[PDB]
């Protein structure tokens, strides 16, 4: 259309979801210059799949989703098709289908604390891997053995969410990274999110 896509609310949102409770914003009926998105500043990761970044200035999509959350630096690599590990298996999973872009940046200066900030959580245990784009916010006690926990934490009975400790002494593999994942959806419908050229 004519009006500019509201990427600022996603990318500059002051607080980010925990990865296990990752957020999704729908982008519709707008025009999206992706070269400016590159140029916001200083993205440590800007990787795309199924599309060329030098081309979706010329493309339209039915809808565009923007998922955001916080993780450790050395886990950003898990935000890609075909990855495994705690984040990919149990918190946030891209398909092998993925046509979109993964954008991330160091957020030590906003999410760390001197004694560590324990408010960002991830799911450490789950009985099976997440499906693509599935979200799990459940907090059942996790039965790692043969004894029914009955909702109480025991030796083989663990609360499923675990805390990052974001502290500035960490160094980059363990500092927090804000991640934004853009999905480009060609659904059996009109296109509403376009690049400025098309």
């Amino acid at each position: 259309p004519t009006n500019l896509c509201p990427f600022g609310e996603v990318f500059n949102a002051t607080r980010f979801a925990s990865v296990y409770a990752w957020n999704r914003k729908r982008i519709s009926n707008c025009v999206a210059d992706y070269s400016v998105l590159y140029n916001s500043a200083s993205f440590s990761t800007f990787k795309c799949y199924g599309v060329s970044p030098t081309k979706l200035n010329d493309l339209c999509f039915t809808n565009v989703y923007a998922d955001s959350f916080v993780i450790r630096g050395d886990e950003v690599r898990q935000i890609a098709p075909g990855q495994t590990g705690k984040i990919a298996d149990y918190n946030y999973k891209l398909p092998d289908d993925f046509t979109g872009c993964v954008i991330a940046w160091n957020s030590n200066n906003l999410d760390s604390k001197v004694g560590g900030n324990y408010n960002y959580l991830y799911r450490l245990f789950r009985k099976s891997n997440l499906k693509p784009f599935e979200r799990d916010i459940s907090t059942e006690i996790y039965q790692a053995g043969s004894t029914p926990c009955n909702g109480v934490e025991g030796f083989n009975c663990y609360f499923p969410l675990q805390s990052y400790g974001f502290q500035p002494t960490n160094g980059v593999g363990y500092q927090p990274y804000r991640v934004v994942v853009l999905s480009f959806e060609l659904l059996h419908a009109p296109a509403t999110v376009c690049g400025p050229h098309h």
């Epitope: 500059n12 002051t14 607080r15 030590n108 200066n109 906003l110 999410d111 760390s112 604390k113 001197v114 004694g115 900030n117 408010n119 502290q167 500035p168 002494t169 960490n170 160094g171």
Partner: antibody, heavy 127, light 106 residues
């Protein structure tokens, strides 16, 4: 040009009230944490209080908890410091200051450097 | 309660290369600022993130250090550089303390 213009300082008796004001310009005020710093005669700087861009999280120095309130009007690009129950030792020059980095949501979370500083008002608590 | 410690005074002459040591509490990592104050006047941010020169600040000021030992160095002391210098942990608002007085040697 970023500017921070302070007003409201003056002379008040022990127990009184004063309201300080820090008019901000040259930047998107609502995106920056702000703080009040002061310097009593013959002592060193101390953080009085601070507040994130949204206003939703604030910090107070121990010596002033319960007695000072910090606030902002993001509409008017203005920071305030409501001071109650003033004591002699609250006598100081009060500066306001802007956070270098933008986007803090919690006042104890993140890195806090202060690039721009106001000129300061003098507050005198005496009878 | 203060989080950083630097010597009360350092004595220097124009031209000199001056260093100010600073010992921080552990667990600060990177988050160390240097501030300059002339008497009665508002302090000025010189260096942030322990080694980043702040905008508009003369290049003769530089900051280094890792862990808990940091240091501000002034390569070519100008007469306007005599002031008080503070090293400040950039989280939970520690008090400034006495800082380091940069005075003229004699």
């Amino acid at each position: 040009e970023v500017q921070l213009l302070e007003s409201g300082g003056g002379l008040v008796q022990p127990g009184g009230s004063l309201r300080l004001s820090c008019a901000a310009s040259g930047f998107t005020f609502s995106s920056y944490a702000m703080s009040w710093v002061r310097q009593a005669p013959g002592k060193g700087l101390e953080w009085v209080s601070a507040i994130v861009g949204s206003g939703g999280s604030t910090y107070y120095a121990d010596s002033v908890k319960g007695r000072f309130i910090i606030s902002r009007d993001n509409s008017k690009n203005t920071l305030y410091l409501q001071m109650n129950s003033l004591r002699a030792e609250d006598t100081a020059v009060y500066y306001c200051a802007k956070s270098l980095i933008y986007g803090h949501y919690d006042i104890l979370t993140g890195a806090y450097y202060f690039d721009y500083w106001g000129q300061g008002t003098l507050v005198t608590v005496s009878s | 309660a203060q989080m950083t410690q630097s010597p009360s005074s350092v004595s220097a002459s124009v031209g000199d290369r001056v260093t100010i040591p600073c010992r921080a509490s552990q667990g600060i990592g990177n988050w160390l600022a240097w501030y300059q104050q002339k008497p009665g006047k508002a302090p000025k941010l010189l260096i942030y993130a322990a080694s980043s020169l702040q905008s508009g600040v003369p290049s003769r000021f530089s900051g280094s250090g890792s862990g808990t030992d940091f240091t501000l160095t002034i390569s070519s002391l100008q007469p306007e550089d005599f002031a008080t210098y503070y090293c400040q942990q950039a989280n939970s608002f520690p008090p400034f303390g006495q800082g380091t007085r940069l005075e003229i040697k004699r």
